[PDB]
Subunit: 398 residues, 3 copies
């Protein structure tokens, strides 16, 4: 009968669905289809935000969704969610997704095959936050090749450290809810390492149109990170939703001060995105009133984080870092403060909490991951893209 | 254990999810994310329909989603869905959403926190049907301030009267399914009171693109107003869907008569919207064949309701009234006729019915709400926006 | 109590929801709203792909959604899903959808009313793959009339043969999962019979924007064809997803060979669509590794199937045939090879399998349907559109 290892059993002998709640499954099923639409969210958002462009990266978002898919089929999933992995990376147990079916996943409440589906949507949103930085006059052929390799040696380590069975941040005692680390910091600082070595209407709608796609999709992103149809799912959604509100209102007032009384529509659009990123690691852990702080604080810190566009000049890919890499860090910190064991308990999840319940040690744990993440995302991103220009016919930039 | 008041219990002592069906919850969770995309539906639809514009209100739709969020966080939810409210308005019991978690809501079949999530999406669609009327050369700063106040003293009373615990239309005996009153009539007649005191391709796609967003989202709007995963949910969806069909076919034939044989693509787009609004208050109460009538009738009555664009001239915000304010009334009336106690009974809902089962008195009850609504939405909208121009530096229009 | 015929019982005497899983229902409910957005997917995709156009068929997609709705209300549903049908067509038992409520449908695991909702979304996507071929300087009035008749005598027979109670392909032993036959082949070869008798940026985004809508929506299309919240739903989604990946990667490499090293963004967009169509009939039956083949093979065969644009010249509607009619056939064949009884068994579905388990006879059965389909879709499409130009005032083309 139910073995809990491999495919979990004989389809001819046992009903593998009996292990799971069909409502928890239905939700993550929905949630899966919602994260995907965040890809042309990045595309439209960063296409429309570019002040300089080689190729409409709204189309180059579809390029990532084919590449990320095949890598994640190939060995991507295995390296993050295998049941026998080390502690730094998983195994290759599931190469080309064989024996991925009915066993409970590293989230015990959905099967491997739906958790492959839903977690596969984060390596793909990461992919377009990556290609999106290095789009300017970059070659197309080697680009795809970059990504495949980058997902393998940069994303997958970080992901297994955060979400993976015997990962070392899970076991340390660090909280990361919907993956600010694996997705925003990973891609915020690997976009920095492109803009150091390989470094207005008629395009406003494309930001906005693009912005809206992301706001919409994050509901599947955060709300479906609870892993079940429970009411913490919907809780995190109330949180997500208003970090994005207070995020975007804050960011509009701030340059309306710093710059006389400057009109800024693209302001509010980014304030939202500043707040969504800022709440990712905390959406299922922090009290609702405190999720306004997660709106405010990363909008401010990221506003000034953009004004570092002139005291070092460079532009191609600092927009990604300005929001996701900073805003992730800011939010991964703030988790350590407001993470409350009594919000976590709404689906029974046991954590020690953060400062909200005098678990002082937590805020340290939180700094442990962000630094490990940022570093790995920078050095190992760096080694590959230098060694990538090294060979002529596999370009990157010109 | 389960107390049914406050947060409903101790997360450390009881499992608060046991009260609810995880499938009813999953659905309204989905449905919630579907109503949201109706906001840039209005935006794109009314931006693209404007014959005259100050600022792309497709972006000014995102402004409403930040403001509506914070107001609804602040005191919005409390005023409509508090468990101890008077009969004209709820209490302030839930200021800044404290003690909103696991108790059954005024819809007993979902928790306060998911019902905050899903019902919060109607105050936000209302918000953009509001700002959307008064967009023309209006100031941005005071605009946000308008809305906040308008949601508080105009929307929230009407909403608590229709949906609220001890509201007086619920207790009277009036049927309103997905809220034609609180959302369309409220915003149809408050858009009239702007165009009295403060009163083509290359923009066709934006109507269409915008139209499509709404048709798509209404499924979450109406279908998720049943409050459960029951098969009345999907019933109302079959209704919604074809009121929009027959709505839009009717509206295309009609000016194809009145105007020689005039081509009208924007016709069909509005006929749909005419029919969606016309079925909102009735989608869960009326037999499917009768939902064609709800397509037809409000398309006609609203077609002529547009031709009042010349026998009084004014334009800025009559498009909103032409569809949602008239079409709501037309549909709130027609509910009283075709509301059938044996459709309501598909999830066990007990009503007296409408004329379909000789409950003659009903059609009166239906007129009681629409008039109360329309009036409150007009007078109290009026007092504020006059007293709003009154002070210089908090403008509205110029 | 539960009678299983008619409306299934007395709403006042029995709870009709008890027959069904509220999670299976919730999903197909969601899935229903996902297939709909595939309509402006076709629209945007084929509008943006047109090298020649009379009227933005992105708006002419909304025309189909009104017409398809009313026909399917009228007699459409009845002809395909009636419980007493012959073997060639169902009955008229459910004319104007009376007595469609709580009985299990021809898929026993959802009620007639939700199965009307969800299956109604395929006759509508078919509708826009139809009108979309014959859009070029065609008249609008008679167009609607065409469709209504075409859905009735062409779509509905094919559909009842594949999905219908006593259909003859179901009973024969043929596998068709999400309906490559009824939807793609039906509309691939009926688009051929228009282009025989009645026969670049600034429009790239519209392909892409349009492409994305379809990729997104297919999850509801294929994943919701399992009919339940089971984990085969999500399985088929993993399949769908990567047939579209490997589909679109293949198609980009291929003209990057055939044409020197030609840049082709519209390539990848179509490769995806080539792969989605290629996996439709197989998504719930074939092993995941084999779903890469379904990506590759129909991308190649359909690439060359486009290069028949010059060795016969004609264009208006060969793009539809190039993808859906060929790609359907290619995929309906390949089902017969890789259909495995042990994937089908994941929700207990009993099939004999295909060649994967030495059921040699299968591949024949598979050819039986595709040919029957293609033929009926051609001859009967032909008779009507010739006899349609026959009468002056009901034009088609000029």
């Amino acid at each position: 009968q139910f073995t809990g290892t491999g495919t979990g059993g004989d389809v001819f002998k046992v009903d593998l669905n009996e292990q799971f709640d069909r409502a928890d499954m239905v939700w993550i099923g929905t949630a899966s289809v919602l994260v995907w639409i965040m890809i042309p969210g990045v595309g439209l958002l960063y296409s429309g935000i570019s002040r300089k462009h080689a190729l409409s990266l709204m189309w180059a978002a579809l390029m990532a969704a084919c590449v990320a898919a095949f890598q994640w089929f190939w060995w991507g999933y295995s390296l993050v969610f295998a049941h026998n992995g080390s502690v730094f990376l998983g195994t290759l147990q599931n190469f080309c997704l064989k024996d991925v079916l009915g066993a409970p996943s590293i989230v015990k409440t959905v099967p491997d095959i739906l958790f492959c589906l839903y977690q596969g949507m984060f390596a793909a949103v990461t992919a377009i936050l990556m290609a999106g930085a290095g789009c300017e006059r970059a070659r197309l052929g080697p680009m795809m090749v970059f990504l495949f390799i980058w997902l393998t040696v940069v994303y997958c380590p970080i992901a297994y450290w955060t979400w993976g069975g015997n990962g070392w941040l899970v076991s340390l005692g660090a909280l990361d809810f919907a993956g600010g680390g694996p997705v925003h910091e990973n891609s915020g600082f690997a976009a920095l390492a492109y803009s150091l070595w390989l470094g207005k209407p008629h395009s406003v709608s494309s930001i906005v149109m693009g912005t809206i796609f992301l706001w919409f999709g994050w509901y599947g992103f955060n709300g479906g990170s609870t892993g079940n149809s429970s009411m913490r799912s919907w809780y995190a959604c109330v949180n997500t939703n208003l970090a994005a509100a207070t995020g975007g209102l804050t960011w509009m007032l701030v340059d309306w001060f710093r710059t006389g009384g400057k009109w800024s529509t693209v302001g509010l659009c980014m304030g939202a995105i500043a707040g969504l990123v800022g709440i990712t690691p905390a959406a299922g852990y922090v009290p609702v009133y405190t999720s306004v702080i997660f709106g405010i604080v990363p909008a401010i810190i990221c506003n000034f984080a953009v004004d570092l566009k002139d005291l070092l000049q460079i532009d191609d890919g600092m927009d990604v870092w300005a929001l996701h890499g900073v805003g992730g860090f800011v939010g991964n910190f703030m988790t350590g403060l407001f993470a409350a064991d009594y919000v976590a308990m709404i689906d029974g999840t046991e954590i020690d909490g953060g400062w909200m319940n005098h678990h002082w040690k937590q805020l340290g744990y939180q700094l442990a991951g962000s630094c490990a993440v940022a570093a790995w995302s920078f050095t190992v991103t760096s080694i590959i893209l230098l060694a990538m220009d090294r060979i002529p016919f596999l370009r990157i930039r010109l």
